[PDB]
PDB file of C-alpha atoms in Angstrom:
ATOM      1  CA  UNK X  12     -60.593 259.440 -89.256  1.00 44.57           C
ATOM      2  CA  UNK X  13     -59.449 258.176 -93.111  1.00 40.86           C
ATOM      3  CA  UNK X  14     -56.167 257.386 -92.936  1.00 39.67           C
ATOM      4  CA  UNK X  15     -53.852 260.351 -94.892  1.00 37.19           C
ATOM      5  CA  UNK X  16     -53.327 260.025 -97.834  1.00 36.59           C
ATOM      6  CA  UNK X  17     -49.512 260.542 -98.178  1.00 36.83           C
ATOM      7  CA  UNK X  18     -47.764 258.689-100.651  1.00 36.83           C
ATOM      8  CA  UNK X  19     -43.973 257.822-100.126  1.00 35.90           C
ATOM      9  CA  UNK X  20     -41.524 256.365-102.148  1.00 37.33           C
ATOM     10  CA  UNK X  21     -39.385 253.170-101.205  1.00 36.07           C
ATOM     11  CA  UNK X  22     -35.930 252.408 -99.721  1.00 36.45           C
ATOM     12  CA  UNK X  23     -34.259 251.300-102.443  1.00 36.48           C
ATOM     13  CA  UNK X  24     -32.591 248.211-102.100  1.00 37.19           C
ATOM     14  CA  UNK X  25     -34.591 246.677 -99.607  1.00 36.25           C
ATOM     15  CA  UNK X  26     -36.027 243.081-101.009  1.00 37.70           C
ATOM     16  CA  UNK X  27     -38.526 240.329-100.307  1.00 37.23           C
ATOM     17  CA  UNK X  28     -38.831 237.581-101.403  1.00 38.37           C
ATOM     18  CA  UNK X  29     -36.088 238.481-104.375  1.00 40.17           C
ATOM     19  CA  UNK X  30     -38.470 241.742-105.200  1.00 41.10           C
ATOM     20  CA  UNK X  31     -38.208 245.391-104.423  1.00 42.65           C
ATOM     21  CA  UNK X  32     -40.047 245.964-101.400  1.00 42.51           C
ATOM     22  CA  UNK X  33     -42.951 248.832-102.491  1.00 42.60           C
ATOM     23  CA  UNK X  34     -43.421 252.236-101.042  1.00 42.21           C
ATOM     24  CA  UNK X  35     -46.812 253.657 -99.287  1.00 41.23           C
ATOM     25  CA  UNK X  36     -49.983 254.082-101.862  1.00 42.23           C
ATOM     26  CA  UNK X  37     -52.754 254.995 -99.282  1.00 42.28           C
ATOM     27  CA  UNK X  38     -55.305 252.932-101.679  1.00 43.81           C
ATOM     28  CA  UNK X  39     -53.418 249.780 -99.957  1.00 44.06           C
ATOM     29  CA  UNK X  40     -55.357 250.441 -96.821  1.00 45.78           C
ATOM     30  CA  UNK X  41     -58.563 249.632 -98.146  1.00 49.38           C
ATOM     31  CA  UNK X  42     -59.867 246.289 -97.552  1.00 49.90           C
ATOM     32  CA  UNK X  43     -57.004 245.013 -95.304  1.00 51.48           C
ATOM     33  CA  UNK X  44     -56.475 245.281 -91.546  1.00 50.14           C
ATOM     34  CA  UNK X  45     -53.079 246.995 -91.330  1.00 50.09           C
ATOM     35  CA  UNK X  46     -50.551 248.043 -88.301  1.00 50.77           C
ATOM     36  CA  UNK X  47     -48.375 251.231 -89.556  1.00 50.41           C
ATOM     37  CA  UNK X  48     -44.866 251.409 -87.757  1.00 51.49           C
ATOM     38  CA  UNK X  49     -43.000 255.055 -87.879  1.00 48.58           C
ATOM     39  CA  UNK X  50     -39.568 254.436 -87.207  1.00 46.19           C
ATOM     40  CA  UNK X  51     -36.180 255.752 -87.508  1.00 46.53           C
ATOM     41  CA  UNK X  52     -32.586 253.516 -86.950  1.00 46.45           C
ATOM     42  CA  UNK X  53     -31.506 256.314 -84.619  1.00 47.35           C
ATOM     43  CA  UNK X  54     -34.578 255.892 -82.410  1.00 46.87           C
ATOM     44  CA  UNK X  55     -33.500 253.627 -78.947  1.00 45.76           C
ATOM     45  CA  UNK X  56     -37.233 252.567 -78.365  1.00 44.06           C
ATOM     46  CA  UNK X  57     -37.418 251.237 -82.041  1.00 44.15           C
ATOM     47  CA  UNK X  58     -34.258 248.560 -81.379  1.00 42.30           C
ATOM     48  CA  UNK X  59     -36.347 247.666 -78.567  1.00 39.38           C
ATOM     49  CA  UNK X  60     -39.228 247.027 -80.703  1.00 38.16           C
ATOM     50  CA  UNK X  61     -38.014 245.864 -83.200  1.00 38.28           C
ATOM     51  CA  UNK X  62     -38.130 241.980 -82.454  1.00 38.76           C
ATOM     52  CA  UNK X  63     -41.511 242.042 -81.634  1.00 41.26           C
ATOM     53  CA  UNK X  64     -42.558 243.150 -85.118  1.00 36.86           C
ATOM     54  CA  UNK X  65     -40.406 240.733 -86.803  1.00 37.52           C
ATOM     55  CA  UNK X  66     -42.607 238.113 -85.067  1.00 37.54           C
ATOM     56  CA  UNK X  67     -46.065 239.811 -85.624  1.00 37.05           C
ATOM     57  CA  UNK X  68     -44.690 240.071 -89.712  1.00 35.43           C
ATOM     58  CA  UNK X  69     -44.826 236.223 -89.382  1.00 35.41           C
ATOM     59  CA  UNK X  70     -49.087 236.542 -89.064  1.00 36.53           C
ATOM     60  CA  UNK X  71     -50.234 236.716 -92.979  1.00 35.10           C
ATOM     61  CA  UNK X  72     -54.154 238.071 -91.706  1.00 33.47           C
ATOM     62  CA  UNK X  73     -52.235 241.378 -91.304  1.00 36.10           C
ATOM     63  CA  UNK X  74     -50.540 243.672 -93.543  1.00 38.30           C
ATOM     64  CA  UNK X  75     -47.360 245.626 -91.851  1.00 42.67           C
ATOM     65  CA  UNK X  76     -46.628 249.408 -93.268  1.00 42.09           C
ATOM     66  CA  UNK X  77     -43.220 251.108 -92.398  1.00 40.71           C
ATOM     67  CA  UNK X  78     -42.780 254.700 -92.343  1.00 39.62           C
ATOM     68  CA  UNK X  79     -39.172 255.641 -92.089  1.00 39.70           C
ATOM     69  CA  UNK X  80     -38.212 258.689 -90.522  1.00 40.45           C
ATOM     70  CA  UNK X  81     -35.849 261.075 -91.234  1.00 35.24           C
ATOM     71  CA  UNK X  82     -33.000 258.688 -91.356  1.00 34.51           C
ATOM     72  CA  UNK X  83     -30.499 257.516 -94.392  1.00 32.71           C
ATOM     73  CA  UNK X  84     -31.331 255.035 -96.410  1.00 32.34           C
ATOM     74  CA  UNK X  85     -27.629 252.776 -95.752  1.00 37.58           C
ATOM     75  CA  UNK X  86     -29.101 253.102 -91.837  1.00 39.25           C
ATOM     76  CA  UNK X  87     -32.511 252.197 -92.636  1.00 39.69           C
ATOM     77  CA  UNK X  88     -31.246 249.420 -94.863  1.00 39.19           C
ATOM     78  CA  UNK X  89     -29.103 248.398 -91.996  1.00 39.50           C
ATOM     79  CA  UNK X  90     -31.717 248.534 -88.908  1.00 39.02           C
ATOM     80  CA  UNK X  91     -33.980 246.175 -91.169  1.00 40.07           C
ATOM     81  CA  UNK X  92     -31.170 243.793 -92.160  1.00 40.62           C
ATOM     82  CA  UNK X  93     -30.479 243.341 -87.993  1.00 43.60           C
ATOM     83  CA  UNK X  94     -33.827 243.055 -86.946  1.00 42.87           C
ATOM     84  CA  UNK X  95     -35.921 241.249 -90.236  1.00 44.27           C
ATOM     85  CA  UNK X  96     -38.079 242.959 -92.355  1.00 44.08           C
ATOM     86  CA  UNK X  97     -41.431 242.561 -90.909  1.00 44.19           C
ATOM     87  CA  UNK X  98     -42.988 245.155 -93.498  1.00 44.47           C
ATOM     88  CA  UNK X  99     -44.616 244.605 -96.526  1.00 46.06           C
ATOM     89  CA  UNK X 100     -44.512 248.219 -97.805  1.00 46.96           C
ATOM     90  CA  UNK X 101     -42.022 250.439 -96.435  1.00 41.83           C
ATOM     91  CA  UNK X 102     -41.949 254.340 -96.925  1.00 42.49           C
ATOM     92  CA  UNK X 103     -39.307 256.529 -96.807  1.00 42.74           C
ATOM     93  CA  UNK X 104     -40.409 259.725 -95.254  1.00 40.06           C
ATOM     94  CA  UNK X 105     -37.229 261.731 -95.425  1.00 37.29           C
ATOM     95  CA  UNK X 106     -38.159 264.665 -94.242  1.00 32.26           C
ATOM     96  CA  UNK X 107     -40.772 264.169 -91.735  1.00 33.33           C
ATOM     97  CA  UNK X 108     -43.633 265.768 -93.936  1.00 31.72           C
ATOM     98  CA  UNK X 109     -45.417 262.759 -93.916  1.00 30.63           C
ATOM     99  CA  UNK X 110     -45.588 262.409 -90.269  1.00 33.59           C
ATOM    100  CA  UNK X 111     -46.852 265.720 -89.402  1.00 34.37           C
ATOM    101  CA  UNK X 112     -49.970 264.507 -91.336  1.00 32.47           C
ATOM    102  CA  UNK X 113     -50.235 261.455 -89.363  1.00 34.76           C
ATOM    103  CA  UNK X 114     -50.240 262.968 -86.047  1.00 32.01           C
ATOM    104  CA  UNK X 115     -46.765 261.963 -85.420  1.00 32.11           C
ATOM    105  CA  UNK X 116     -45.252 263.640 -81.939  1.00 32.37           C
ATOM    106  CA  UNK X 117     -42.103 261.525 -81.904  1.00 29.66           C
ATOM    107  CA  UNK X 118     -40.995 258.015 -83.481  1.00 29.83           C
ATOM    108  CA  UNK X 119     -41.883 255.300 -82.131  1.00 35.34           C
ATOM    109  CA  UNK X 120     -45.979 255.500 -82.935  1.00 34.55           C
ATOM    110  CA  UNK X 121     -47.858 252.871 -84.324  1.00 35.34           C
ATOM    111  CA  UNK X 122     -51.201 252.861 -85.955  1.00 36.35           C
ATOM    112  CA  UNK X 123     -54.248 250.717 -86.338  1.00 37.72           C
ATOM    113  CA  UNK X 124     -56.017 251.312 -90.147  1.00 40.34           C
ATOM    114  CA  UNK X 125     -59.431 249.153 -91.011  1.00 42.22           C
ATOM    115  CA  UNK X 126     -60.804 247.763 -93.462  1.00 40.10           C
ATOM    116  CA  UNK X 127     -62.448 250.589 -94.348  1.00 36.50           C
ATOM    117  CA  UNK X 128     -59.353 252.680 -94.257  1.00 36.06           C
ATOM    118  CA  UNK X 129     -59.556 254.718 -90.989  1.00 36.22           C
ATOM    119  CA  UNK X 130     -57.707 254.512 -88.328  1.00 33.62           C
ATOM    120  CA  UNK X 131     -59.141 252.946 -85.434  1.00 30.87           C
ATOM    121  CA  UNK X 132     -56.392 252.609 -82.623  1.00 31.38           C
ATOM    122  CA  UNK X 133     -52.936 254.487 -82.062  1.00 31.65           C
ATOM    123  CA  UNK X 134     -50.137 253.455 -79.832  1.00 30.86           C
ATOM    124  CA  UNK X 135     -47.518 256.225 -78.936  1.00 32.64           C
ATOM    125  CA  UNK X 136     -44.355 254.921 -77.512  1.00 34.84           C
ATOM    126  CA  UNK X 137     -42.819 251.400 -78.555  1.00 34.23           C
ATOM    127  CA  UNK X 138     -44.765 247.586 -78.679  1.00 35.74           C
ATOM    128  CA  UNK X 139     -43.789 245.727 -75.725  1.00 38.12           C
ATOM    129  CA  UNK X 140     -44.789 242.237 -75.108  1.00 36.95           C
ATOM    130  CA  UNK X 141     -47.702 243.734 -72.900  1.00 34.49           C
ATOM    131  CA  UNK X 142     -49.295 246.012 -75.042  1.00 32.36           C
ATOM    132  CA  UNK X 143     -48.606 243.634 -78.128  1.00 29.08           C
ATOM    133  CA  UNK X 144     -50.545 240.437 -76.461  1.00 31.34           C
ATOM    134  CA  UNK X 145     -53.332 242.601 -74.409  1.00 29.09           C
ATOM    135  CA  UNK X 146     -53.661 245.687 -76.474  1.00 30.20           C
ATOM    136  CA  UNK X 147     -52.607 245.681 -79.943  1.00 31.33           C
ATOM    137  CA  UNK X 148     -53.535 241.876 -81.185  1.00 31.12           C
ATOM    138  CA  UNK X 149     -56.919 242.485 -79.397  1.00 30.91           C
ATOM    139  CA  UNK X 150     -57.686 245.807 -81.338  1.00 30.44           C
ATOM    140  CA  UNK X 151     -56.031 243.941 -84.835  1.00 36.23           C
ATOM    141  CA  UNK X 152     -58.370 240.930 -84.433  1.00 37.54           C
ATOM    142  CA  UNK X 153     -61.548 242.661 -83.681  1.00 37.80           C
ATOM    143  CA  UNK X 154     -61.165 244.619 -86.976  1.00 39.80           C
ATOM    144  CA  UNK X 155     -60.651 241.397 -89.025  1.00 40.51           C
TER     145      UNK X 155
END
């Protein structure tokens, strides 16, 4: 299915590369092969993934989305300033709204969106080094 097409603002304060990091526009789907992360800094699974996306941020064929839910901005600012910023858009979807739209049953849940701005693959639970080598990458590549 197209991906929604929720718009969220940013967490303010978050930088890269000396530049406010943008919110979610759903026309910066199209033409990219992008993984969508819904996360919260309350969330245990999410510590545990974090490191792995930090690493995965480090391949430029891919763009990283953030959706962060239902959590305060100083925590949200604080899980990504432990872990790295892996994201290259980050959304701030305060209360959940956004989410629901998405399918979301619970945070962790990551999403696969194609070039031609569907979604083609959906993880619930968090990456682990498993599914990230032999699942995810697989399904990322094959939509390049």
């Amino acid at each position: 299915r197209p991906a929604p097409q929720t718009a969220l603002p940013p967490l303010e304060g978050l930088q890269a590369d000396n530049v406010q990091v943008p919110g979610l526009d759903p026309a910066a789907f199209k033409g990219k092969v992008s993984l969508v992360n819904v996360w919260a800094s309350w969330c245990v699974p999410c510590h545990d993934e974090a490191p792995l996306l930090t690493e995965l941020g480090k391949d430029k064929r891919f763009q990283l989305v953030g959706i962060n839910y239902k959590d305060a901005a100083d925590n949200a600012r604080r899980f990504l300033g432990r872990y790295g910023n892996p994201f290259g858009r980050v959304g701030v979807d305060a209360n959940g709204r956004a989410s629901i739209e998405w399918g979301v049953y619970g945070v962790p849940e990551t999403f696969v969106v194609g070039r031609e701005g569907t979604i083609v693959y959906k993880l619930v639970g968090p990456i682990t080094p498993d599914n990230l080598r032999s699942v995810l990458l697989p399904q990322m590549e094959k939509a390049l």
